[PDB]
Amino acid sequence: YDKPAPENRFAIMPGSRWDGVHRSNGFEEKWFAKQNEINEK
């Protein structure tokens, strides 16, 4: 299946040092959020 668009492969988990501040780099990030946000299956 042809992917819709390229994205990050290595999903490195965040650390406490990240302070938890908002850090964005691409709107595509919404895709990752959708995968994590699943309440129906």
Binding site: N8, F10, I12, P14, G15, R17, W18, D19, V21, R23, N25, G26
Partner: protein, 118 residues
């Protein structure tokens, strides 16, 4: 990619177009998720110092550097676009414990497989 040398944990990236007030803590937080470094180096003018204009941090993984690069590449922060690029300079040399690294001490037990398969 540096064949015959294969450098070890020597992953470094150049960071430019950063805020003047930007401190080490801010840099760590920004890159923290994108591969938090184990050390941050900030250039300073011995003549006066204060300002930097250049900074370099060591990444745990050389592959993780791709994330921050493609992520913070052209990314706007504080009205300034970040400029990420691969470095080529080497860290302060230290000839001490590395002495034991002399000669092929391990090298898969001097190439256990030897020359190809029997």
């Amino acid at each position: 990619g540096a064949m015959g040398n294969e450098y070890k944990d020597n992953a470094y990236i150049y960071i430019g177009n950063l805020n003047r007030e930007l401190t080490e803590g801010d840099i760590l937080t920004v890159f923290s998720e994108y591969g938090v470094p184990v050390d941050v180096i900030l250039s300073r003018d011995e003549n006066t110092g204060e300002s930097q204009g250049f900074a370099y941090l060591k990444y745990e993984d050389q592959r993780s550097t791709i994330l921050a690069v493609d992520n913070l590449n052209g990314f706007k922060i504080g009205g300034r676009a970040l400029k990420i690029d691969h470095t080529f300079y080497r860290p302060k040399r230290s000839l001490q414990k590395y002495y034991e690294a002399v000669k092929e001490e391990l090298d898969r037990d001097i190439v256990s497989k030897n020359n190809a398969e029997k």
